Design a binder for these strands. Structure first.
Length: 70
DNA sequence: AAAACTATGCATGCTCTACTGCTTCTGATCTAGTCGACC
């Protein structure tokens, strides 16, 4: 039940962010994914266990996709 | 010496106050099921 955390449970809630759509009266929804990913590193400094940024890896072949799936 | 008045004990009924047993109401507990929302 991440849907409803229990107080006695040892595990806690974590937020893995993979997009930003607005920062300081600047609308990022019409921008490219590259620029939003770049901006996402200038909003918060992640602290493991509570808030994090999902890692994206560059790839330009099908074999890379298959290796990641495996 | 005989008769009338009064005292005390006892029977009698009725009324009132504790104790035991049956029935019903409430509280507490457990078990089973439903719903919100996600995925």
């Amino acid at each position: 039940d991440i849907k409803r955390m229990v107080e006695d449970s040892d595990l806690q809630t974590c937020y893995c962010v993979f997009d930003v759509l607005m920062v300081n009266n600047k609308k990022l929804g019409h921008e490219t994914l590259r620029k939003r990913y770049e901006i996402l590193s200038s909003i918060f400094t992640p602290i493991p266990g509570r808030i994090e940024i999902v890692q994206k890896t560059q790839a330009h072949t099908k074999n890379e996709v298959i290796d990641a799936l495996n």
